Design a protein around this ligand. Sequence first.
Ligand code: MG
Lengths: 105, 673
Amino acid sequence: KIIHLTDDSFDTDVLKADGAILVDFWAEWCGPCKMIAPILDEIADEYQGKLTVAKLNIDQNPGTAPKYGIRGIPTLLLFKNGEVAATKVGALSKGQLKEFLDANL
Amino acid sequence: MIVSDIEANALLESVTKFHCGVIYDYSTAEYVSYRPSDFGAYLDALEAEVARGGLIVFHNGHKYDVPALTKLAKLQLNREFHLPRENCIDTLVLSRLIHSNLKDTDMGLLRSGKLPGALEAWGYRLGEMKGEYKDDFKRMLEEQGEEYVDGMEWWNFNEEMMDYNVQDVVVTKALLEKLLSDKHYFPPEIDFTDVGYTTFWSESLEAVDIEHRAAWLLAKQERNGFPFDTKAIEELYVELAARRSELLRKLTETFGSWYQPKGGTEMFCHPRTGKPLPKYPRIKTPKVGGIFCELDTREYVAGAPYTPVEHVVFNPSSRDHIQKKLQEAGWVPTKYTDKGAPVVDDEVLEGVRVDDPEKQAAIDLIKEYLMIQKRIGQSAEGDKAWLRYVAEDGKIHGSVNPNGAVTGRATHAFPNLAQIPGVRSPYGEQCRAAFGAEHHLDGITGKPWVQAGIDASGLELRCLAHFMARFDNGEYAHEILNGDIHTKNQIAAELPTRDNAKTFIYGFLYGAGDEKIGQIVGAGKERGKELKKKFLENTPAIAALRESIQQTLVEKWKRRWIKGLDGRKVHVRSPHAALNTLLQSAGALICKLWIIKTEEMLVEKGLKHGWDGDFAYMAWVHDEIQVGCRTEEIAQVVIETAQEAMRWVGDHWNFRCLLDTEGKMGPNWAICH
DNA sequence: GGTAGTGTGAT
DNA sequence: ATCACACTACC
Ligand SMILES: [Mg+2]
């Protein structure tokens, strides 16, 4: 139930959307990314009512990440009305995310 | 004979103060030191050795000490002083001839570390003196609590400098004798530290005389410089930099930027087994952070790993990025480097084929970009860039090592004026035109000088003819100057288009390979060996020659060297390139004795060498010279004289193939091509 | 601020 | 083949 993004659908899917949207900037080669990946499926399913989870593979979509100064992956960006509300880097845990979410939502 | 050496406040170009000198006189076995105020006496001592028909030994004296003393004598004592060429011996010139299979630091200009192979001990010591001296200085100042500055070790005379000075004559004297103990160049019968100058050149191998005359003339050439159109190259740089930008824009669009891991310190281990995973990019585990009670704005959570990354923008200069983007377009590398990596030279880039048309088209942009950068690099941005080398007198004084190559060829550097782009390559006209006599205005009449470019005609083939004359009685030689050797070789080998044969021959002489050989007609790469068999089959003399050369070296060697036209030994790296070494060495020594004889003949005709004279040597690029002349008439004389001298050289070495030259008059290197 | 690797510039 | 030197990528 996760939104799979692209550079061209970003502005409209994330910035011009209602509600909080958590974006995961990841890559196939990154280790921590492949780690927090399963966690996201659950999170996307649990908060299925008050949050949308979206992934952006930075190799297929090389234009967006730079606009946010991505310096490490996976990078989690929380958007609220087209702006970055909260941001955390690194493969957080199923519970660390829950905290970050509940605390920022 | 006397061995000498001096210490001054700078390089020839800007020296103004004679700090000190030392002389060892063989006739008295003593070392006399000369401090600042003994300069007049130092000079008297050298002229004294000249009056008695003696000899003066210096290490790198031909390029520094002698011209330096002339200059310093005129500036500090308002005295004219000119050591005659015939009275001077240079142990640096001697080592380069005797230990030709070795390199050297060009008196400290090159880092020992970067040089391959061993180095003659005494020579290394002599070339490292400025560096060691600077070390003792810098080390001693700091013990006195003072800041060290640029090159203050050379501003004033001191006793540490005088000690180093004496040391030099000590080592130079040892090096000199080590060199004289080589019976191949100096007969054991004679004591060369006890003969007059005319005997020293006379009784030693011909090569000693040639190299000393070559170093002397070439020292003059560096001083002359090559008139350079600075403004011209700056305007060209603006153009090139523009085309570079535009090529970067179009390219940084077709090929987007990407992300790459970078900055990773810890190893990534499977979160389940712990199995280290070195194949995976290195990560980093933040030691602090947490989600938090005030929220924690920071972006890291302790224990939560992440792969630190950087944003890399396509750089057309990086063959790696190019290899990364093209395979990603469907390019399947064929030939890799002998060290794990795809080949991305202009040849392969030329053969790459991809689906996306825009990509296929970008490949040409990349090739143009690489070439543009090559030009910018050589003319403006590189370390040895022309614009960084032009001097106040408006000339580029390129360095030349009269015998820096094994074969006896010279090497040129700072900047290598023997590698200016040719008129046939992209932007070669403009580059080449920026180097010309026209860019020098006469010191008296303000009028532009004229240039004379003379090229030894088909020297490599003539040298080949000569050496095969022993087996074909001058057949090849005769065909060269009467028939169409190129056609004859066209019939020897099959190669359709008796012009592919010309490509074939010069290839056959300068190494080349079966692939490139067959690549003349068509594909037939290694299959082209068949062609390199028909030739040698229809030209048995070249085969006889090779066999004979082998008998000379191989038996495990019977001898590891070949005898050049002037008797010197010419180290042979591999038996496979022996014929090549022989030929290149011949052409080399022929062109050396040639530019030497040319200038002597010009001087015996009345003409003076210098910008304050009639002609000025500007450059010597293996088989060619470019000479600045004050007038067309003089330019006509130089050309005629370059032809006479070449014939004289041919006669001098009983060459079995008539030798020639062709010259062109013009304003610069572009027209004189 | 050097080293190694890969390449191009010329005869 | 013989040689100089530039630009990338790495410590
Ligand atoms: Mg000296």
